[PDB]
Amino acid sequence: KIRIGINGFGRIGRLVARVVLQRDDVELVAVNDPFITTEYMTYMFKYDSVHGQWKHNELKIKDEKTLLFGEKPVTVFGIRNPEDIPWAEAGADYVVESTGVFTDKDKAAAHLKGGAKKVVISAPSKDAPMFVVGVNEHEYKSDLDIVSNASCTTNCLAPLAKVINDRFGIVEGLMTTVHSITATQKTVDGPSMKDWRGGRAASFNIIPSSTGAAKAVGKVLPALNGKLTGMSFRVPTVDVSVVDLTVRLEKAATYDEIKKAIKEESEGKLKGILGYTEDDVVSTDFVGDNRSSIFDAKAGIALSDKFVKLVSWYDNEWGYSSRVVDLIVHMSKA
Amino acid sequence: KIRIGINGFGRIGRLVARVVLQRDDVELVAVNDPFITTEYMTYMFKYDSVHGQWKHNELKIKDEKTLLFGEKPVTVFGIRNPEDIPWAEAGADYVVESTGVFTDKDKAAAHLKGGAKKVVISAPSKDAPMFVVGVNEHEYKSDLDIVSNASCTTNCLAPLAKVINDRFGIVEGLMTTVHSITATQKTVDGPSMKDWRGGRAASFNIIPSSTGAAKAVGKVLPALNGKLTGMSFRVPTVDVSVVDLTVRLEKAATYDEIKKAIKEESEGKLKGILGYTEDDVVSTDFVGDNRSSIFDAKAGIALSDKFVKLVSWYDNEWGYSSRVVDLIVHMSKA
Amino acid sequence: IRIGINGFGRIGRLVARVVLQRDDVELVAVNDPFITTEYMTYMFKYDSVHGQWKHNELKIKDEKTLLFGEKPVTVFGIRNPEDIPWAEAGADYVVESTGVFTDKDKAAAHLKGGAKKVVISAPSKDAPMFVVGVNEHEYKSDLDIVSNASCTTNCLAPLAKVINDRFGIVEGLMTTVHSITATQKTVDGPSMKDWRGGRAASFNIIPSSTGAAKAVGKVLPALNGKLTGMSFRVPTVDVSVVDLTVRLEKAATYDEIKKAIKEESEGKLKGILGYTEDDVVSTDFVGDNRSSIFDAKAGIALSDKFVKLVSWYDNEWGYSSRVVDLIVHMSKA
Amino acid sequence: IRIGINGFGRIGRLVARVVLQRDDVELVAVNDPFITTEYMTYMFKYDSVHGQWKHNELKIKDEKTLLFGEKPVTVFGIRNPEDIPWAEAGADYVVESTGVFTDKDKAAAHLKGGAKKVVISAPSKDAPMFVVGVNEHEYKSDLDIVSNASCTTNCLAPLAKVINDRFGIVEGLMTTVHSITATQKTVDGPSMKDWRGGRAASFNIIPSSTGAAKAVGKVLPALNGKLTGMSFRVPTVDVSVVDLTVRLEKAATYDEIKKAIKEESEGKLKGILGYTEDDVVSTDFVGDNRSSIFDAKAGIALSDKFVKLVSWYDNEWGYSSRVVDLIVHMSKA
Ligand SMILES: NC(=O)c1ccc[n+]([C@@H]2O[C@H](COP(=O)([O-])OP(=O)(O)OC[C@H]3O[C@@H](n4cnc5c(N)ncnc54)[C@H](O)[C@@H]3O)[C@@H](O)[C@H]2O)c1
Ligand SMILES: NC(=O)c1ccc[n+]([C@@H]2O[C@H](COP(=O)([O-])OP(=O)(O)OC[C@H]3O[C@@H](n4cnc5c(N)ncnc54)[C@H](O)[C@@H]3O)[C@@H](O)[C@H]2O)c1
Ligand SMILES: NC(=O)c1ccc[n+]([C@@H]2O[C@H](COP(=O)([O-])OP(=O)(O)OC[C@H]3O[C@@H](n4cnc5c(N)ncnc54)[C@H](O)[C@@H]3O)[C@@H](O)[C@H]2O)c1
Ligand SMILES: NC(=O)c1ccc[n+]([C@@H]2O[C@H](COP(=O)([O-])OP(=O)(O)OC[C@H]3O[C@@H](n4cnc5c(N)ncnc54)[C@H](O)[C@@H]3O)[C@@H](O)[C@H]2O)c1
Ligand SMILES: *SC[C@H](NC(=O)CC[C@@H](N)C(=O)O)C(=O)NCC(=O)O
């Protein structure tokens, strides 16, 4: 039923491929990467430095056109531009924009001319519609040709911000995210003309960089629009990131009260999306965590009973790619 | 004139030794480390994985009692407990408490029975007097038997917090410090019974841990006492750390205004202690920076003109050990 | 078979993972004076390399027992060994994983704890050495106390045995590129026993020591004095590789060497010596429970008598799997 | 002597540091299409390994010149080489540091730029290869375009020359434990030319390729076909080590080998081959400008004809020092 093809077998592309491969509501029809060879795709999928080897399927058949995942056959495209890929000729309703270069509303629209019914954008986009599963996936409508699943950081922030606002209200908030390094960085000092500090050696530097993660938590949560901002800090970890959010509350609460409220919501409307822990966890403890956001109770601290600092964890790779397929199923139905 | 002996040839002990070795107002009389051998001390001093090889002096003479720094002779003690070291019998007025185990007011008092006129504690202490050069070293008085130079994080926060408060006033602030790993951490998962997350592998984890850095910025800046708190994040860097401070201001300002005020103070009463940069700097750019705190203009962001997030850098090893000898000279004179 | 672990370190905890998941064996007690029994729950549960645990073990009583499912495991905080009452909770086989008691007589303290047999989680100067799959068969059940050698020995010895057994090695020099361990330092600090071992582990290529190459002969008397080597510690959490440089008595071609190692991979050395022709990397062997895996594509030969062979081992996982494989071989008389 | 650099990368910028601080040479122009001339100021000024610069170089005019003190350096953003007017700002000697133009004919594009001589910041398939201190003397001033070989070659060849020159090496196998470079990846990504090179560089021991061992013979025809080897990339910013395994024609003892290398250290190989008996570590060679330094204490011999020798090199700094050492040797006819 839900036939899928992925555009760009990157970090997110391969990992959301793993997610859809071990589910029964979802299927994998095609993959497009002009840079990866069909024999190379098997190696890239099988071996992972973060999430480990794959326990099910894996094999390539045809000279250079079809791979065998188990006995499900997946189609491979090495096509540079998006409209030139015949997304229908292998059945692909939902295309994952996992490439990172075609982010914008019009730029993902390129897939519909390949014969694709809908496309979901990995990254946030300047104009394409933005949804964070569990906080506003419900304002999706089926006229929508093209969609965006926002960012890892948005997906961790917005569920956590929403319960705080929805039971105590946020007046103003400032966020930092200390974030693992990604494919856009460099091993050693090199050119990254659009972010100068992004060119510096990723694994041996604490890199200040920017993410819009916060104001977007209003572009999808319009109640909090223009109420938050932040920055980032890229630091030498392969995967897993944490959000440090500092907000003042209109309605006074105690740290135990906000803790108990987050536990409440963790087992309610937000179960499996926003989690709760009171353990002495660290970075590694969330590799493979398929939740958008988990709440580090012990980490955070309160100054007033209206001014508090909240800590929450997210696997920027795994949990986010779980969320993209969670979104695709919601639009299937709705 | 200013004769010095250091207790504990650790990271800070050796580095403040380098600082005093290349100054003319200061001298090096003795070093005590029960764990380091006088031949081993030369190796540990000469070769440094962070700050590099040493350009001046270095040689050991006596079988196992005296080292030759240039032609200045330094005395070496391998004594377990503090009062059992004859601090006078080599002329030592000022003893650096660089050990980390004798932090408390009474526990550093142990050096005076060795015949030492004054002792300065590297770390912050529960009761010993606390001074951050450039913000309250002047409230030092010469009755003081024993003193503490506070923490790296305090030394970066308090100068930066003081100009913000002193020209706009801080109502409430929450701070995070993303901090390099230190000697108290473990290479791989091991026992650290007093901080559980501190036992996790330092170089491959983002470790939430606590530092009191903020409320102390009142124990030495009583105008801001009980007005700030924070947490830490230990991440896989050898050296250099940054403070992310989030405060609301009673008196409204614009980001350019606060930038210009920090530049003003950078060249005034705080010159050489609190610095100013508008460059796309990264972690490595402050190794060997001898300032307590440098202000990252471009990094930070403002939400309101009364609610702002400020970013400032500090070399937790080098700048802090520069500050300990800066403090010792102030107490020499005062 | 009842097993108790001394020192819930890296090797101790991971040997606990092994024995808790296999069914021919069970875990009776653990002793660590530096860890509190609740702290063992946290440290066992959470692992930066091998991940969270997918079964369950919890605390029952204030300081004395944990329950994995519903089985005891009594917890000791005893500083020195002859004071550990391995009989009083009935622990027949003891893992000496502390690293401080390598010597035969110093680990003998467990027999006075009322423990019938002792396995050293390390090489020892004066304890019989066995590398499962190459000499585990020379154990005798009179021998009270023993050593399973080192990770590096357990990786080298199968490969050395196969290479010598089919072509004969004249002389060998070995290098291992090795992950950092608990004995290294976060930052430059005192390590008087290894001066380069005190240097910041994660920012350095640190030259270090290994006995493993000399050790091969102590369990493979055919090559005694025919190998020696060195180590290089590098900033990785886990997984290490052996770089072996050998002169061959019998000339062979690299592809022939590949098929010989493949043969033994598939045959009696299965699960001890593996074989791959993949573009493997260190990460690809986290959780690999083999003693040694052979990186075919990596290695190179200069002549048909002079060749360099590359092989992988997870210093944590594979060695601990070998530890309880050895213990069960010793059960079987 | 006027020098211009093509590609302000790691090697390009650091060769710029060298030529800007020495006085027998000067720096005339730089070309990089991916860097804007203000961006060169930022990237040259700030370095994660070698630190900030202690002199000064700034921008003068919108895109065309920088001033180090008050000397020009004109800046080019030209994609392909024959379009770089090395004559029009008068740059006689060109550093080809881009890494894409190794081939003799492809770097010949600078002679059409009006440049009299070209030095390849790398090995090349079809360009004469020189390792300063071992064969720099065979340059002829008719040869228009050239290569300085690789960091690994420049470290191995002095040590191989000394060892062979006094004891003769029969066969050699080499390993290098090497820092990561710009060609590796932050996270697992496409590198179809080296499949293991795309894997996350900083979390892996990555087996990789080297021609340096075969290359030694191309500049040391005595040992042609007597050495070969492999590499291991490990998560460090800079500094690498060679692990050399040799068979000796003339039997020697390790201490004798130590004093022979010490002799050459002190003598004609001074500043190219260094010698230490210290507990050195990788960090200790950041900024070390020698081709090769000999870690005496590290290495080990099996017999007096079979020995393993360890030597250090800063792949960035020492190689770039060698680059302009070569250029000035070529000035001198
Ligand atoms: N990496 C993360 O943790 C993460 C998390 C959430 C969202 N995102 C977003 O997802 C997008 C991709 O992220 P990533 O980390 O996977 O980057 P990546 O580099 O790992 O993936 C990019 C992949 O796309 C392929 N590709 C490049 N050009 C292509 C094209 N023209 N057509 C088809 N494929 C092409 C490349 O081969 C590469 O495999 C980015 O926009 C990023 O912001 C990333
Ligand atoms: N490391 C930093 O960046 C930093 C910065 C500011 C303040 N501090 C504080 O300074 C203190 C030391 O810090 P560090 O990083 O140098 O730790 P460290 O481990 O590097 O130094 C401790 C040194 O003290 C020696 N020592 C141990 N016991 C001793 C004793 N009984 N008598 C004499 N010497 C003994 C050890 O040999 C070791 O060399 C700590 O309290 C720390 O909080 C550290
Ligand atoms: N780490 C490896 O990759 C590896 C692999 C194979 C073998 N080994 C060997 O195993 C031994 C332990 O290695 P590790 O990495 O687990 O070290 P580790 O530091 O992680 O473990 C040592 C543990 O023993 C405990 N301990 C100390 N004294 C004790 C006492 N007297 N009684 C009970 N417990 C005590 C400590 O609390 C610590 O938890 C070493 O000899 C090492 O050489 C290590
Ligand atoms: N990195 C090392 O430790 C090292 C050491 C010795 C030799 N080398 C060799 O030197 C060469 C470069 O190495 P690197 O580490 O500096 O790589 P790098 O990526 O740091 O440098 C390449 C630079 O060349 C520039 N460039 C690309 N195309 C260009 C063009 N056509 N014209 C002008 N500039 C262009 C790029 O912008 C980049 O800045 C490689 O061949 C490498 O093998 C590297
Ligand atoms: S993980 C989601 C991802 N965002 C980022 O990695 C940017 C993170 C930023 N704050 C930083 O530098 O740390 C994403 O969805 N991509 C959007 C983008 O930045 O292009």
Ligand SMILES: *SC[C@H](NC(=O)CC[C@@H](N)C(=O)O)C(=O)NCC(=O)O
């Ligand atoms: S660098 C000054 C040092 N403080 C710390 O390293 C603790 C930092 C903490 N926030 C963290 O875990 O990141 C110091 O002066 N020592 C005091 C101490 O913590 O003992």
Ligand SMILES: *SC[C@H](NC(=O)CC[C@@H](N)C(=O)O)C(=O)NCC(=O)O
């Ligand atoms: S990992 C097994 C361990 N041996 C080592 O620590 C040596 C690692 C070697 N390759 C190196 O130096 O890097 C062990 O069982 N303990 C050995 C011992 O000290 O008894």
Ligand SMILES: *SC[C@H](NC(=O)CC[C@@H](N)C(=O)O)C(=O)NCC(=O)O
């Ligand atoms: S560092 C010099 C560089 N050579 C290498 O990249 C090889 C490094 C080797 N030890 C390894 O693989 O790790 C170079 O000058 N370029 C070589 C080339 O491709 O031409």
